[PDB]
Amino acid sequence: AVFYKEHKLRNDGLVITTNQGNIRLQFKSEAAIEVLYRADSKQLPSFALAQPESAIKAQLTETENHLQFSGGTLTARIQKRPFAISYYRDSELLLAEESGFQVKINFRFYLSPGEKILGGGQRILGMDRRGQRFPLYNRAHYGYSDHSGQMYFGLPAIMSSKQYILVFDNSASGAMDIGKTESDILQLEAKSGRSAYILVAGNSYPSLIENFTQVTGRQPLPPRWALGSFASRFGYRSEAETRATVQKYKTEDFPLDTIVLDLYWFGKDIKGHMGNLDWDKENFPTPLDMMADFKQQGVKTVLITEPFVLTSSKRWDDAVKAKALAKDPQGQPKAFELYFGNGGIIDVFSKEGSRWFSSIYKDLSKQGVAGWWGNLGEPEMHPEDTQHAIGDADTVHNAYGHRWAEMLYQQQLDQFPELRPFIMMRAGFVGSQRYGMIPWTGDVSRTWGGLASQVELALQMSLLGFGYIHSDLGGFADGETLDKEMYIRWLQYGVFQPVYRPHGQDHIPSEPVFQDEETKAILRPLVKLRYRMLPYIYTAAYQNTLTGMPLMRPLFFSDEKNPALIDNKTSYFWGDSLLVTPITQAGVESVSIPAPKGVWFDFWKDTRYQTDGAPLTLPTDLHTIPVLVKAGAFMPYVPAVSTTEDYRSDSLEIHYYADASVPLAQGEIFEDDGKDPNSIKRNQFDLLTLQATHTDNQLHFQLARTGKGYRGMPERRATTLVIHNASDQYQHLDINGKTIAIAQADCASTPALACYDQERRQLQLVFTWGREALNLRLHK
Ligand SMILES: O=S1(=O)O[C@@H]2[C@H](O)[C@@H](O)[C@H](O)[C@@H](CO)[C@@H]2O1
Numbered sequence: 001a002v003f004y005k006e007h008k009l010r011n012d013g014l015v016i017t018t019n020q021g022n023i024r025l026q027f028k029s030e031a032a033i034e035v036l037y038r039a040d041s042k043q044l045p046s047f048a049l050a051q052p053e054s055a056i057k058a059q060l061t062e063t064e065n066h067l068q069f070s071g072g073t074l075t076a077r078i079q080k081r082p083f084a085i086s087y088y089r090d091s092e093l094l095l096a097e098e099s100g101f102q103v104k105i106n107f108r109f110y111l112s113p114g115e116k117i118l119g120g121g122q123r124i125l126g127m128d129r130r131g132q133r134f135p136l137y138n139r140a141h142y143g144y145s146d147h148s149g150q151m152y153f154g155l156p157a158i159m160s161s162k163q164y165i166l167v168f169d170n171s172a173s174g175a176m177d178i179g180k181t182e183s184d185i186l187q188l189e190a191k192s193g194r195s196a197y198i199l200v201a202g203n204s205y206p207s208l209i210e211n212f213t214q215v216t217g218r219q220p221l222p223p224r225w226a227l228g229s230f231a232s233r234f235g236y237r238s239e240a241e242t243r244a245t246v247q248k249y250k251t252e253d254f255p256l257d258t259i260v261l262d263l264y265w266f267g268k269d270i271k272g273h274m275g276n277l278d279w280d281k282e283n284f285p286t287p288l289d290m291m292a293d294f295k296q297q298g299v300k301t302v303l304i305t306e307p308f309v310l311t312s313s314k315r316w317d318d319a320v321k322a323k324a325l326a327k328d329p330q331g332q333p334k335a336f337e338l339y340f341g342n343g344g345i346i347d348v349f350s351k352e353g354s355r356w357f358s359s360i361y362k363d364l365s366k367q368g369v370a371g372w373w374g375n376l377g378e379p380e381m382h383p384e385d386t387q388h389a390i391g392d393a394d395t396v397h398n399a400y401g402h403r404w405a406e407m408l409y410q411q412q413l414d415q416f417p418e419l420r421p422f423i424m425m426r427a428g429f430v431g432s433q434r435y436g437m438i439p440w441t442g443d444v445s446r447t448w449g450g451l452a453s454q455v456e457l458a459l460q461m462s463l464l465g466f467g468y469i470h471s472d473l474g475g476f477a478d479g480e481t482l483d484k485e486m487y488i489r490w491l492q493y494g495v496f497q498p499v500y501r502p503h504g505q506d507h508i509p510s511e512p513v514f515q516d517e518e519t520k521a522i523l524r525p526l527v528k529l530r531y532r533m534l535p536y537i538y539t540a541a542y543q544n545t546l547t548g549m550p551l552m553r554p555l556f557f558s559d560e561k562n563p564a565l566i567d568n569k570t571s572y573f574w575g576d577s578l579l580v581t582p583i584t585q586a587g588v589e590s591v592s593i594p595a596p597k598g599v600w601f602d603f604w605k606d607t608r609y610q611t612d613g614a615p616l617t618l619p620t621d622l623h624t625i626p627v628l629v630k631a632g633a634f635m636p637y638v639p640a641v642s643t644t645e646d647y648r649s650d651s652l653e654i655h656y657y658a659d660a661s662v663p664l665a666q667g668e669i670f671e672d673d674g675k676d677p678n679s680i681k682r683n684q685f686d687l688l689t690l691q692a693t694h695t696d697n698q699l700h701f702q703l704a705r706t707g708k709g710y711r712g713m714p715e716r717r718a719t720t721l722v723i724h725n726a727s728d729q730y731q732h733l734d735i736n737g738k739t740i741a742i743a744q745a746d747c748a749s750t751p752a753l754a755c756y757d758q759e760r761r762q763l764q765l766v767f768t769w770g771r772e773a774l775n776l777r778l779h780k
């Protein structure tokens with residue numbers, strides 16, 4: 001039994017006093033509030049908030065039985081007796097406390113009937129997690145397939161169909177019960193740590209995510225090369241083998257930006273060497289030459305590092321001596337048995353651990369390393385009596401990887417202020433995106449079920465801040481012989497998800513260049529397609545940096561007033577315009593795609609479909625997976641290159657999908673130098689926009705460029721605009737008032753400026769796109 005006693009308004013925050021203690025409410029923006037219970041006491045600081053000490057002016061009003069604390073869109077309604085806070089956007093009930101806070105740490109809230117709940121991060125349980133209970137304790141799930149209540153990267157956060165996000169801003173071993181134990185109760189609990197939650201509201205799912213990333217952090221734009229092709233396996237055993245793999249990509253004509261080196265770079269065996277963090281010179285004898293030779297071919301090098309230093313490693317004595325390791329309660333270095341052997345964990349929460357670890361990254365980055373892979377940051381083993389500078393293992397567990405990322409991000413920005421850090425990690429916390437974390441879904445089995453779970457995993461992480469969530473393409477764990485069909489399907493899906501990184505245990509090849517002729521004839525043009533689509537992908541990335549909009553969006557974005565779509569985890573949006581339906585079983589002959597009402601085109605075949613609600617049945621083939629294009633889409637391409645180091649947009653090819661049903665459409669292409677962390681902030685970019693206006697007798701395109709440009713930017717781009725489903729009635733074209741006749745023959749066979757292909761229903765326009773506005777008008 002809890003009740004209101006008294007309140008103060010101080011430094012813009014409302015401090016309430018109950019019979020059981022102090023509660024501090026600070027608005028972190030107009031649509032986001034931090035509620036800290038036990039505000040009187042010493043607690044761990046926030047990990048989730050990008051600006052933990054901010055509070056914006058709010059309107060407090062008092063009545064008899066209630067208080068009302070309001071920012072712009074979000075209102076906290078604080079009932080006095082019994083004490084219960086509830087949350088409103090306008091006068092719509094988002095979320096009400098039941099008992100609220102208790103003692104362990106425990107928060108309890110009501111769930112409205114029919115409310116659907118996404119969240120928890122990586123779980124394979126269904127998209128609506130209501131009716132489920134699971135732990136908040138990051139932990140490996142080696143060889144998972146079609147089920148998991150607990151894996152590498154949990155998030156103490158949910159997204160509701162009421163269009164709010166709730167963050168349990170707590171790093172400790174805990175649990176989430178989403179109306180499982182009691183129908184109508186959401187319960188959050190932890191063993192220790194901060195007793196705080198954060199509620200964020202939105203008018204729509206895009207605005208919600210914008211609001212969320214506003215307060216938890218925005219991903220800075222990764223380097224363009226992160227959207228390229230990675231060569232990876234576990235693992236290249238030598239410099240010779242790694243040079244041969246870069247060579248194989250060249251001699252097989254597959255694009256390649258980055259080669260990833262697994263744990264054999266620092267020692268000849270899986271066991272016994274972890275913590276060396278230095279080249280195994282018997283197997284990598286000339287690594288500066290190696291990395292420089294690769295950079296001559298436009299190829300970057302990424303190295304795996306782990307949080308553990310083994311007692312058998314070259315660096316044990318030094319790490320002990322520097323006080324870099326986490327300690328036991330006696331106060332000496334804590335050592336424990338890992339798979340790899342006996343060892344300690346680097347204390348990234350301490351000054352001495354951070355400096356020691358940072359110095360090692362600095363030395364290797366100076367040698368040529370372009371990016372970093374941080375593996376096992378759950379941490380994979382983490383005994384409860386391990387003591388970090390700010391708390392014990394069970395208190396800090398779910399923030400270890402988060403702090404590892406922050407440490408490494410700050411370090412890379414300090415060493416290379418003109419480059420974008422590349423940081424790939426397995427485990428983090430809410431807001432780790434603000435440190436550039438690129439997560440992957442761990443050690444997935446080489447099974448169809450492993451593939452069939454990846455969309456669910458990607459969407460759950462994308463919705464809560466992680467745009468670059470991806471999988472080990474082809475599958476990682478076990479298997480004895482390649483499942484060729486599953487592999488092909490996985491690398492096809494690969495094209496339409498955030499990072500193109502095939503990776504697996506090296507008894508079966510993960511790289512597409514090591515596959516048979518049929519497999520390479522299928523995948524080679526799709527990996528080239530990935531490169532041709534870089535303007536589309538990089539523009540989605542730019543939008544993610546601006547607004548948190550993820551690259552993969554769920555089907556439920558298409559209709560916010562149909563909550564039944566929340567369950568779908570087989571069809572998703574890649575950017576604004578493509579609905580992708582991966583094939584997740586062997587031998588599937590056709591698919592039923594639940595395309596939103598409107599007009600859609602087969603991406604591969606140009607076929608036009610219209611639907612008023614009913615699904616579309618498409619046949620399948622081995623060469624592709626089913627992709628529909630939304631009418632009104634602008635799909636931009638550039639010619640395929642071997643490496644994004646050679647990237648050029650001097651030649652653009654843009655495909656517009658016309659339909660009279662879409663009378664107004666827009667597209668955007670974001671260009672910059674692909675490497676500068678300050679390009680957006682300083683406006684050192686070239687933002688191309690395209691607007692189509694489609695009426696009964698006219699189709700009109702308005703083209704423009706904004707931004708201050710960048711070094712090497714083309715002043716003029718050769719542009720081919722291909723209009724799919726173009727009317728055969730268009731008589732003439734004006735380009736900036738200059739009339740041009742539309743040829744009706746020989747389009748593929750003449751240097752035609754405007755030509756209609758009657759057999760394909762495509763109108764092709766070729767022109768020069770310079771810095772000034774350009775208007776193209778077609779009239780009947
Ligand atoms: O248990 S593993 O086989 O899976 C772990 C990682 O998640 C993989 O990405 C990595 O390639 C392996 C070697 O460093 C690790 O051992």
Ligand SMILES: O=C([O-])C(=O)[O-]
Binds near residue numbers: 729
């Ligand atoms: O829709 C049009 O404009 C047509 O097909 O003629």
